Design an enzyme around this catalytic site. Sequence first.
Site, PDB file in Angstrom:
ATOM      1  N   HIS A 365      46.567  40.892  30.199  1.00  0.00           N
ATOM      2  CA  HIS A 365      45.810  41.711  31.144  1.00  0.00           C
ATOM      3  C   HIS A 365      46.297  43.136  31.366  1.00  0.00           C
ATOM      4  O   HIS A 365      45.759  43.844  32.216  1.00  0.00           O
ATOM      5  CB  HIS A 365      45.749  41.008  32.507  1.00  0.00           C
ATOM      6  CG  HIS A 365      45.043  39.684  32.475  1.00  0.00           C
ATOM      7  ND1 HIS A 365      43.696  39.555  32.718  1.00  0.00           N
ATOM      8  CD2 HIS A 365      45.509  38.434  32.243  1.00  0.00           C
ATOM      9  CE1 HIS A 365      43.352  38.281  32.635  1.00  0.00           C
ATOM     10  NE2 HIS A 365      44.440  37.574  32.348  1.00  0.00           N
ATOM     11  N   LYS A 556      39.497  50.109  44.675  1.00  0.00           N
ATOM     12  CA  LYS A 556      40.343  49.298  43.797  1.00  0.00           C
ATOM     13  C   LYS A 556      41.767  49.509  44.301  1.00  0.00           C
ATOM     14  O   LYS A 556      42.009  50.426  45.096  1.00  0.00           O
ATOM     15  CB  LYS A 556      40.252  49.789  42.346  1.00  0.00           C
ATOM     16  CG  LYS A 556      40.806  51.215  42.108  1.00  0.00           C
ATOM     17  CD  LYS A 556      39.708  52.171  41.656  1.00  0.00           C
ATOM     18  CE  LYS A 556      39.430  52.050  40.164  1.00  0.00           C
ATOM     19  NZ  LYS A 556      38.272  51.180  39.841  1.00  0.00           N
ATOM     20  N   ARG A 557      42.710  48.696  43.837  1.00  0.00           N
ATOM     21  CA  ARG A 557      44.084  48.855  44.296  1.00  0.00           C
ATOM     22  C   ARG A 557      44.533  50.288  44.035  1.00  0.00           C
ATOM     23  O   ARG A 557      44.041  50.937  43.110  1.00  0.00           O
ATOM     24  CB  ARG A 557      45.011  47.876  43.574  1.00  0.00           C
ATOM     25  CG  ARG A 557      44.889  46.439  44.064  1.00  0.00           C
ATOM     26  CD  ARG A 557      45.307  46.333  45.510  1.00  0.00           C
ATOM     27  NE  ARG A 557      46.747  46.497  45.662  1.00  0.00           N
ATOM     28  CZ  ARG A 557      47.603  45.479  45.683  1.00  0.00           C
ATOM     29  NH1 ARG A 557      47.160  44.229  45.562  1.00  0.00           N
ATOM     30  NH2 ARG A 557      48.904  45.704  45.823  1.00  0.00           N
ATOM     31  N   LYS A 562      45.186  54.589  38.134  1.00  0.00           N
ATOM     32  CA  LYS A 562      43.774  54.537  38.534  1.00  0.00           C
ATOM     33  C   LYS A 562      43.346  55.962  38.922  1.00  0.00           C
ATOM     34  O   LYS A 562      42.154  56.265  39.034  1.00  0.00           O
ATOM     35  CB  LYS A 562      43.570  53.574  39.712  1.00  0.00           C
ATOM     36  CG  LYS A 562      44.196  52.193  39.528  1.00  0.00           C
ATOM     37  CD  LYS A 562      43.173  51.149  39.124  1.00  0.00           C
ATOM     38  CE  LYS A 562      43.534  49.770  39.664  1.00  0.00           C
ATOM     39  NZ  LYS A 562      43.120  48.673  38.730  1.00  0.00           N
ATOM     40  N   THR A 664      36.708  45.418  36.385  1.00  0.00           N
ATOM     41  CA  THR A 664      35.573  44.536  36.662  1.00  0.00           C
ATOM     42  C   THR A 664      34.747  45.129  37.798  1.00  0.00           C
ATOM     43  O   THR A 664      33.543  44.864  37.925  1.00  0.00           O
ATOM     44  CB  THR A 664      36.032  43.123  37.036  1.00  0.00           C
ATOM     45  OG1 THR A 664      37.162  43.212  37.915  1.00  0.00           O
ATOM     46  CG2 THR A 664      36.426  42.335  35.779  1.00  0.00           C
ATOM     47  N   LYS A 668      30.687  45.489  38.598  1.00  0.00           N
ATOM     48  CA  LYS A 668      30.018  45.184  39.846  1.00  0.00           C
ATOM     49  C   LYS A 668      29.060  46.307  40.261  1.00  0.00           C
ATOM     50  O   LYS A 668      27.941  46.045  40.706  1.00  0.00           O
ATOM     51  CB  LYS A 668      31.047  44.949  40.941  1.00  0.00           C
ATOM     52  CG  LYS A 668      31.807  43.653  40.789  1.00  0.00           C
ATOM     53  CD  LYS A 668      33.041  43.675  41.673  1.00  0.00           C
ATOM     54  CE  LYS A 668      34.217  42.983  40.998  1.00  0.00           C
ATOM     55  NZ  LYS A 668      35.230  43.014  41.993  1.00  0.00           N
TER      56      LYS A 668
HETATM   57  O1  LIG Z   1      47.568  42.889  35.955  1.00  0.00           O
HETATM   58  C1  LIG Z   1      46.348  43.106  36.042  1.00  0.00           C
HETATM   59  N1  LIG Z   1      45.538  43.250  34.980  1.00  0.00           N
HETATM   60  C2  LIG Z   1      44.180  43.573  35.391  1.00  0.00           C
HETATM   61  O2  LIG Z   1      43.367  42.432  35.015  1.00  0.00           O
HETATM   62  C3  LIG Z   1      41.958  42.548  35.312  1.00  0.00           C
HETATM   63  C4  LIG Z   1      41.238  41.250  34.884  1.00  0.00           C
HETATM   64  O3  LIG Z   1      41.527  41.034  33.529  1.00  0.00           O
HETATM   65  C5  LIG Z   1      41.394  43.829  34.428  1.00  0.00           C
HETATM   66  O4  LIG Z   1      40.009  43.966  34.598  1.00  0.00           O
HETATM   67  C6  LIG Z   1      42.125  45.124  34.870  1.00  0.00           C
HETATM   68  O5  LIG Z   1      41.629  46.212  34.155  1.00  0.00           O
HETATM   69  C7  LIG Z   1      43.709  44.914  34.716  1.00  0.00           C
HETATM   70  O6  LIG Z   1      44.403  46.059  35.299  1.00  0.00           O
HETATM   71  C8  LIG Z   1      44.394  43.572  36.943  1.00  0.00           C
HETATM   72  O7  LIG Z   1      43.465  43.835  37.822  1.00  0.00           O
HETATM   73  N2  LIG Z   1      45.716  43.260  37.240  1.00  0.00           N
HETATM   74  O8  LIG Z   1      46.252  43.208  38.521  1.00  0.00           O
HETATM   75  C1  LIG Z   2      36.460  43.292  41.617  1.00  0.00           C
HETATM   76  C2  LIG Z   2      37.619  43.632  42.612  1.00  0.00           C
HETATM   77  C3  LIG Z   2      38.817  44.235  42.176  1.00  0.00           C
HETATM   78  C4  LIG Z   2      38.979  44.859  40.755  1.00  0.00           C
HETATM   79  O1  LIG Z   2      38.603  46.230  40.738  1.00  0.00           O
HETATM   80  P1  LIG Z   2      38.834  47.205  39.525  1.00  0.00           P
HETATM   81  O2  LIG Z   2      38.035  48.376  39.841  1.00  0.00           O
HETATM   82  O3  LIG Z   2      38.644  46.519  38.263  1.00  0.00           O
HETATM   83  O4  LIG Z   2      40.423  47.573  39.645  1.00  0.00           O
HETATM   84  C5  LIG Z   2      39.836  44.470  43.068  1.00  0.00           C
HETATM   85  N1  LIG Z   2      39.681  44.146  44.369  1.00  0.00           N
HETATM   86  C6  LIG Z   2      38.535  43.572  44.799  1.00  0.00           C
HETATM   87  C7  LIG Z   2      38.454  43.193  46.249  1.00  0.00           C
HETATM   88  C8  LIG Z   2      37.499  43.305  43.926  1.00  0.00           C
HETATM   89  O5  LIG Z   2      36.371  42.665  44.352  1.00  0.00           O
END
Ligand SMILES: O=C1N[C@@]2(O[C@H](CO)[C@@H](O)[C@H](O)[C@H]2O)C(=O)N1O
Ligand SMILES: *Cc1c(COP(=O)(O)O)cnc(C)c1O
Lengths: 830, 830
Positions: A365, A556-557, A562, A664, A668
């Site tokens: 990931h 996002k985090r 990012k 992801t 969305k």
């Molecule tokens: O360590 C990771 N890898 C992550 O995995 C997600 C699900 O595969 C990916 O969509 C994301 O791009 C990647 O940073 C993620 O959100 N975290 O925390």
């Molecule tokens: C889908 C989702 C994420 C992932 O977001 P990315 O833009 O891929 O980093 C993180 N937090 C929440 C609450 C989400 O629903």
Amino acid sequence: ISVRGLAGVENVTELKKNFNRHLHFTLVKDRNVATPRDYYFALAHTVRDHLVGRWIRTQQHYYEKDPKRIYYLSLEFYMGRTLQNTMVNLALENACDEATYQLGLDMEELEEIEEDAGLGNGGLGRLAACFLDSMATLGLAAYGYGIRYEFGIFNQKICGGWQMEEADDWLRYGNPWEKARPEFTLPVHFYGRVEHTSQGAKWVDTQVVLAMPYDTPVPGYRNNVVNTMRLWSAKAPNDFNLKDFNVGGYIQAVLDRNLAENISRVLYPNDNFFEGKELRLKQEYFVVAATLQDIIRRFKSSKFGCRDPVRTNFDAFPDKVAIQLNDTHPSLAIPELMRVLVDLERLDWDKAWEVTVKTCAYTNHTVIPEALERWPVHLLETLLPRHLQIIYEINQRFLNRVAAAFPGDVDRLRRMSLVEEGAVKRINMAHLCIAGSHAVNGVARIHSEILKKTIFKDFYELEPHKFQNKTNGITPRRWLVLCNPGLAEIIAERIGEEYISDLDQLRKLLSYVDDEAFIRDVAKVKQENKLKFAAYLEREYKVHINPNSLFDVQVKRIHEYKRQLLNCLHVITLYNRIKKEPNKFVVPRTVMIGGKAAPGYHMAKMIIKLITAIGDVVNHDPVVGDRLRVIFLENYRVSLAEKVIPAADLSEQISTAGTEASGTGNMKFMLNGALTIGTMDGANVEMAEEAGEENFFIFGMRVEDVDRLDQRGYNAQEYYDRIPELRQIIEQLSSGFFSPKQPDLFKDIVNMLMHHDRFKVFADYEEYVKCQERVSALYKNPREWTRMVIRNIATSGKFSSDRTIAQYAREIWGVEPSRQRLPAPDEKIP
Amino acid sequence: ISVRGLAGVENVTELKKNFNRHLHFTLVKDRNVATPRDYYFALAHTVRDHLVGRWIRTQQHYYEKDPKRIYYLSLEFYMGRTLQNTMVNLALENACDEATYQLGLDMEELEEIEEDAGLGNGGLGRLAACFLDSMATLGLAAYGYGIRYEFGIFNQKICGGWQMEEADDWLRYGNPWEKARPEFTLPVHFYGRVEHTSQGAKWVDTQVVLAMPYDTPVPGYRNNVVNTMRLWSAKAPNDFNLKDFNVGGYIQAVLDRNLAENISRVLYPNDNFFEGKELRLKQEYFVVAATLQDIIRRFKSSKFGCRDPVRTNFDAFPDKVAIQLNDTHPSLAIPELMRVLVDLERLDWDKAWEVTVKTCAYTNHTVIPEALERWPVHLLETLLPRHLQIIYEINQRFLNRVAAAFPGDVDRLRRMSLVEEGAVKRINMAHLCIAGSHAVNGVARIHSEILKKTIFKDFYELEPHKFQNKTNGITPRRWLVLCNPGLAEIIAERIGEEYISDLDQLRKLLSYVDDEAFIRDVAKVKQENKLKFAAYLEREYKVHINPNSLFDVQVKRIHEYKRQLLNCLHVITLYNRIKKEPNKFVVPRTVMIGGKAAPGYHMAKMIIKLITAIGDVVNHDPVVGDRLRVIFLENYRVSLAEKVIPAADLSEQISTAGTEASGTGNMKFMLNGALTIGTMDGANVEMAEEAGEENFFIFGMRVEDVDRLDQRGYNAQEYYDRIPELRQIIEQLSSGFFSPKQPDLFKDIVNMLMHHDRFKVFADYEEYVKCQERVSALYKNPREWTRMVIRNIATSGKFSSDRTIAQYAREIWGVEPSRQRLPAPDEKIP
Ligand SMILES: O=C1N[C@@]2(O[C@H](CO)[C@@H](O)[C@H](O)[C@H]2O)C(=O)N1O
Ligand SMILES: *Cc1c(COP(=O)(O)O)cnc(C)c1O
Ligand SMILES: O=C1N[C@@]2(O[C@H](CO)[C@@H](O)[C@H](O)[C@H]2O)C(=O)N1O
Ligand SMILES: *Cc1c(COP(=O)(O)O)cnc(C)c1O
């Protein structure tokens, strides 16, 4: 009302009485003292009732037919609320809405009372949740296995512009969905030592911690299939955790039980970052050790625990079992599976290894180094002595394979080793997973290629067959039907309902791209969504926004990769331009930035302070008016995501090319009618490829450009020197324009930006604002903006987790998905 | 089948379906995988269903009518199992028995699965439980308030003859009876400091621990009244217990929550012994602070929280509230009530004191010094600073009252002080309770007199009106109908059923004392009870006994004052006599000794080892045969008591005259057809007085004799010198006759017996064995033994807790008991 199902006469009546039954008998309350929270529970219990019948037959079914079982091991499962989702998958939404209405209650108001199941950090955890929903919807005999933390991701509070973390006591009032199964408690060992005696090694003098399972139902979409998510809880044995005698204190002995139970107490709040703490390692072995015993037990019964060849032949193990490793967190499953097979079942090494490799599969990931798990040997040595011996042995044999394939390539040998020499010896969990799995996959096409070309190049050359790709996806149920019923309805009005479990059908919407009615409708729901959110904002957080402006959101985090910082630079720029030519027209925007920062991530917490700092200035400048608002979305989480995404106009996915594995959230936004401005990173590439680059706002360096720049050497000063607007912003930060009382407050950010920017924010600045101008231009043309939206929505089908799971199923697990309705839920009591 | 109620046609059918409903929907199981434990729960839930209806109307009732409320504060509530008891009080036993039978299950087998609610040590805790049952049966608006320990009294294991303690995880599988009420969580403060500002003192900078209540229903006997037992659980706030920032670690902060939650983790296993630990003190303030807020809230609503004189006039507080202090454990309630009234409500001291004294009442349970609570001032000073100031002020004013009443009596002043000078200053909780209560009572006539004559003589001279007596009692429901249905049936066959809630009616049995049928029956049930127990013994513990022998049992906590040692001396004597004249006939006996020793009580644990040591020798001597067996009853507890007592022939209540406050086990044996051999101590005096001394086996020193001996000075050597049989035993112990491998094993016991016997065991030896001979003589005459039994049973009426509660009600609380059936349970949903 919508296609949230039928509000049948008999069923609404039935619902109501059961609601009352629970309010009385289960909650032990009377209408005169019941509060909204009580009403929420009565309902939850009433709804939960409808899927136990299906839950029992589903599990019984898999016992009779005995199909290959899929085990999804993950340390994270970001579930969110489960009331509505359950109503939707069971076609109960309208009936419940009606019934509660007749009972004089607002279902929506009750849904807001449900606490989020935040057993995850972000993307990785949420993927696991979407997968579970898809596996159930596709009729797979799949089980989600994890840890039942009593404290999930912390709740974020902004105090004086700073993030304040506070414990997420999600179980405070109880969890009506789970079912404790104390009768299936298993023991897990720690520490001890290894005895080599006559016929085999023995793991001895270990400390025992018990693992108590809790089952939560996972209903498929309208197919009567209800799978199980089993979460383990740590419990202390009542013997040794008291019985190891000879003074200490009886009371103290009992109070000390909360030492073995601390294992499942809290989730580590790190996203894409590795922390080598013992507690974490303990959590990792805990979920693995317990789960495996459960897997083997189920296998021993199957149809072998009756007859078959007769002789516990684990040769069919891989034909009946498949375990998927969500990242390297559950990597110990490999050496643990060997331990059991070799030490306990007494299989020869080679036979055991063949079985292990054939049943294990690993999903990667991320590619950033600081996220890679490298456990110090002294830790494994103390905590899991036998596992260390097994790993060394696995390494020995693997390297021998390499030497034989690349004779004389001595550097390759040290590079591929599962063991890393240096300051302290470490074990590279990722190398372990590759060696002991029959498949390794990336989460987006570009990410998968990067693995083969870079990080795992040597491994790819050795066994090219292992490497694959499985582009992430999201569930159309929660991420469309649930959070955006309005958009789902108008889509269904034209193309039907079959698309909820067959998102590819969204393409049929392409033929309405010029439909005057549709364009008006698509535009209408988005306007309604923005109005509802703008309201929620003043309701729960308080201080107005303008629903006519462009909703620019990045949720996002918080990370350096990012680039929320890049977003910040643009915002300040917009501000400066307005201040330069006040009476010039500009498309109004409400930029919303939200996300959580890991508690120890200083920079990330500094960026949050910056965002709020910008809003303090921008939001109170009279010359700006309502043309520009900067808002920091507090406590971003699944439930909050279900509110903003549907109300977003512009989705920000601006990570540095090559750093975001897939993403992801981007998906969305695309499915909910927002346009995307982003870089050619992760799944963004496949999204633009699917909707056509003309319907996407791509900008910045591509991966190659990034590399070219690194060869050359990245110097931020250059950009500072050649771009006045950029220079102006940096000097504003440096002089305290955004932090009057504390002028040097943002010195770390500036210093970092100018001297140690690992993600070259400046390198993409120019192309980013230029691109931002293009979206403002298009927003000024409502009709065309909406038509481009229809092009994105109609083309997002590929990004449904049903597609992803179907691929895992066929290309990795060796099972065939099925959209066959399980034989009704109908009573039955054998 | 018996008078366990009617097995109605409609209700047995109704029961069965509900049993199935729960097995499916609540337990989420199917007949094919359900285990006895599952069946027990389905039933429990089905039974629990029947009293929620009554629970809700009862509580609603008290809200409408608004009667004076009784609050029973105790740190202990020894409840035991609650399934059967609930069936009995609801007249559900036969219907459930029938229904479960038709479902193909043995109700009795299922009842054995229920874990005991061991939130008590022994007598004090069990009294609280019997009281609760009686208060509900007498229609009092009473509430039991305590602490919901997650670990009750430890489970006792005998390893190599030694006691091994192990955690009592009674909640492991859940508690179907309680109802968590997180919505009524209250805050409790600790530490901090006192600020004296303009208009009053302020308790500031305190640490907050939250108290979460759990309600358990307490059904009266067949009157549709269901009262509430509220148990508090400690919970950490999610703010400061995380929010007190500036480095430490986020993870560590969350793990450290189990520091405030340790308060309700475990019950202190001491019986009649004071341990001055901070944790204990914290538990004591915790239950008091939380309970009071609940009491005042309820009061503020009443009919004052509507109108009345209008002005929160606490003048009617004592007319609406009564709080009973079970020993000094909840003594802080006095200074806490003042704190609230004075500091928060702003009443003047004198008005506040008048109210406090008028609502508080104290019950004393022991006279031994080591059991008296004397808290070091430095502890109160640190933990509860404001309470210490209040106590000093209470002391100041009280002593001024004394000085005024006894001018010049300077020694009296220091003697009565709530503050004790010396090594370390302490606070005498008992003095506090007397001063702040309008009534102080003993638990048996002799005990009450001792208080007035000795321990609290000065207090009695000051306010003679405060002192009373309330002889303990037990509940005929659990202690007769529940554990001995056989005896209850034959009694009912002759005199009806009205005696279950009117035990005095047992006297009518006197007229059957010569009835040939009755004598045969009474004798028959006892024989059946002995056979069932003798079986249970081999079933669960394994190693035979003879059901024809005299069942000589002593079951109660292990103490030096209970003199299990005296019992031991007799046993060895019997052995030695048999070994001297092998072929001489003697009445066979099975002496059973059981009880738990506090973990830190070395002597008590030494005595347990002695008992088992004796059994090792005696039980394996071929010459003895089946004439003498010594058995140590393991893990004595409520559920075990319900099994032995009904099967006992001889009840041992041999404490040193003046040490056992009252005792209640003695009463349990008398009502179940066992004869009593004992000293003129506690309630033994009133029991013999009730049955006539001719029907009792009294022996030993009276209180006066003990005192005479103390003036003289107790010298054990004398007895050793003049009694050869006694000498012979002591030398057997001294030489290792009972401990071959470790000859000096019992040197502490011998040393103690000869040089520091606080309970003069030797002084009562001669009269004890002589008396024991008299019971053997009478046992040889079955017809006469049984007639004497009928004299005890028929005369035990006075010892029902209904009598005791009725007295507390009238003479202390100012309320009138009522045996009026609450208006049915009937549905209703307003
Ligand atoms: O360590 C990771 N890898 C992550 O995995 C997600 C699900 O595969 C990916 O969509 C994301 O791009 C990647 O940073 C993620 O959100 N975290 O925390
Ligand atoms: C889908 C989702 C994420 C992932 O977001 P990315 O833009 O891929 O980093 C993180 N937090 C929440 C609450 C989400 O629903
Ligand atoms: O501290 C005490 N006091 C006790 O209280 C019981 C109930 O009042 C009495 O019957 C008993 O005699 C006394 O020792 C008791 O059993 N414990 O533990
Ligand atoms: C009644 C009871 C007690 C009290 O016994 P005494 O003989 O008064 O000391 C203690 N333990 C249990 C389990 C009881 O039922």
